[PDB]
Structures are given as structure tokens and as C-alpha cells.
Amino acid sequence: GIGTGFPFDPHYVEVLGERMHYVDVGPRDGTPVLFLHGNPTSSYVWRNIIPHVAPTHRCIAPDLIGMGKSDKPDLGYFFDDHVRFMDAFIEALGLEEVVLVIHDWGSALGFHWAKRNPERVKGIAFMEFIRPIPTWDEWPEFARETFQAFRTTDVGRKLIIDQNVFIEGTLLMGVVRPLTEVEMDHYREPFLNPVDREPLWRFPNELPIAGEPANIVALVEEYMDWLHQSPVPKLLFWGTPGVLIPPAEAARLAKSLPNCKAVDIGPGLNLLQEDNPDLIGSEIARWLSTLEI
């Protein structure tokens, strides 16, 4: 079945005075492919996708600051903090032109960096990505009251920080197929200590839903406007019913985004990588061979 191991040798780089962990495999030359995870995952979410790409392209998969094997300083872990560290990680590795493979909050990082640095982005593969959610009616009904509760400093912190609900419950409700105990232990490992769970709570409080927070909504609207005009090659993966990207939204993007190929992965919620890694990996590898990289 789907692989549960994480066989990658650890790599570390100092970034703004903190150590960030990253996977780094594949050939040394060529245009690298930079894989960005979101909440509440790590580079572990790419473990079954990278092996389809690493034969022919360098794959770099960092753990976001405060997550995975990266350092966990006592920050608020706002989106702006993640932007500062990811900007610096990219520079610390000396990356020039990249292809991006992005998911959930990693897609907000990737699209925001791409919009600010369009000359350095040769392609974007994306899935279950951060877009403005116009009203709460556009958040999936089965998860609406819980995400509304997450976005409070009393109940939301009790659930996410004290009780680890984003790992023990929300994560499982973002994958259609059942995760194994081994896989769950990989996802639990960075957050065994409750004091380290701040990013798990701040991330859903940054989601652009019903106009809040206004600053994130504005930032996300900006990169979506860029994406709707930019000629950058685009590869969209979507599933049914999805979470952030329902089928009808995927269809709108497939019809409207320039230079965009859309791939239906079958059943999927948020972590599409956990439901169909073989199709995502093989399609990324095929798409890469068509780029001018």
C-alpha cells in the first residue's frame, strides 16, 4: 500500500538564527523543485510524491519554522512569520529559479513568493490551496462549527493546544482513506509537547474566511489576481469533495487560469497526497518534462 516510511537523510540550515530541517534529494544540477507543506503536516506529507520526481530533478522539502524537525522558537507563528523564514530559507540555500509544489498554507507561502518574484518561478503545481473563502457557507458544512470554534482564544486553544484536536481529529478528517498508526506517529512527533502547538492554532486563525483576517484576505486576493493573468505554467490537483477547493472551484480555475492543466485525483479532502500519491507524483514528473527548465 501507501508508504509509511520517511527514509530521507536530514539536512539543516541556519535561517534567521534558527535551524530549519529540509529534505534534499535528486540530482545536484538543474532547476530544483521546492515542496511546501501546510497545517498540521511537515515534509512527511511529500514522502510518497518526492520519489517520482527525485530520479530526474532535485527535490527540496523544508519543514516550516515551528514544525517538523525545524526549530520551534516561542513565536506567534503568524503567516508573516512563516513568510520571513521561508524567504530566508530560499536565500540560505542559494536557490535561483525554482518549480513550486505547494499545498494548504505552503501554497500561500508559494503563491505569495511567486507573485513577488515571478522571474524565478518556472512552474507551480498546487492542490487544496489557500484562496479567499467568501462566506462561511463556502466552508464545508461538516467542518464549519469546529473551524469557527478554532478561531477563538478560549475554545479554540483548548481544542488545538490542550487537546491536540488538529492532529488527532482534524488531520484524519482531511484524508478519505484511514491513516495508519505509524503514519499518525509521524504526524504527532513534532507536537508531543503542548507548548509547541502554537502554529497549529494560529494557522486556522489566519485562514481568509468571510473577510477575516482582512490582511490575509488582501494578501491572498493579490496573489489570486496575479495567478489569473500570469503565464506561469500551472498544474492543479483536485479531489471530491475537497475541503478548500471543491470540485466546482477546481472547474472554475481549470477553465480560467492561463496555461493550467487540472488533474482529478479521485476521492479527496485536504491532504490529497495521502489519498492518491502515485497519480500526484507521476503527473508532476510528466508535467516537469514539458517545462523549459
Q: Quick one: 66 or 204, whose CB is closer to Cl ion?
A: 204
260 CB-contact burial (10 Å; exposed 0-12 / middle 13-18 / buried 19+): middle
11 close to 283: Cβ distance less than 8 angstroms: no
The one segment of 9-17, 93-101, 195-203, 251-259 that binds Cl ion by CB under 5 A = 195-203
Q: Quick one: 117 or 215, whose CB is closer to Cl ion?
A: 215
Question: Contact between 106 and Cl ion (CB under 5 A)?
Answer: no
Window 17-56: contact mask with Cl ion (x via CB under 5 A): ----------------------x-----------------
Q: Quick one: 49 or 160, whose CB is closer to Cl ion?
A: 160
Q: Quick one: 89 or 203, whose CB is closer to Cl ion?
A: 203
* Shortest Cβ 130–Cl ion spacing (Å): 9
Binding residue for Cl ion, selected from 147, 187, 203, 223, defined by CB under 5 A: 203
Encode burial over 39-65: b for 16+ CB neighbours within 10 A, e otherwise: bbbbbbbbbbbbbbbbeebbbbbbbbb
* Shortest Cβ 163–Cl ion spacing (Å): 16
Q: Quick one: 108 or 125, whose CB is closer to Cl ion?
A: 108
* Shortest Cβ 5–Cl ion spacing (Å): 26
DSSP letters spanning 187-224: HHGGGSSGGG-HHHHHHHHHS-BTTBSHHHHHHHHHHH
* Shortest Cβ 212–Cl ion spacing (Å): 14
Strands of 33-36's sheet in order across: 11-15, 18-25, 59-62, 33-36, 98-104, 121-129, 234-241, 260-268
DSSP letters spanning 86-131: HHHHHHHTT--SEEEEEEEHHHHHHHHHHHH-GGGEEEEEEEEE--
Q: Quick one: 85 or 147, whose CB is closer to Cl ion?
A: 147
Total binding residues toward Cl ion, as defined by CB under 5 A: 3
Amino acid letter for position 125: A
Question: Contact between 204 and Cl ion (CB under 5 A)?
Answer: yes
* Shortest Cβ 282–Cl ion spacing (Å): 28
- Could you list the residues that contact Cl ion (CB under 5 A)? 39, 203-204
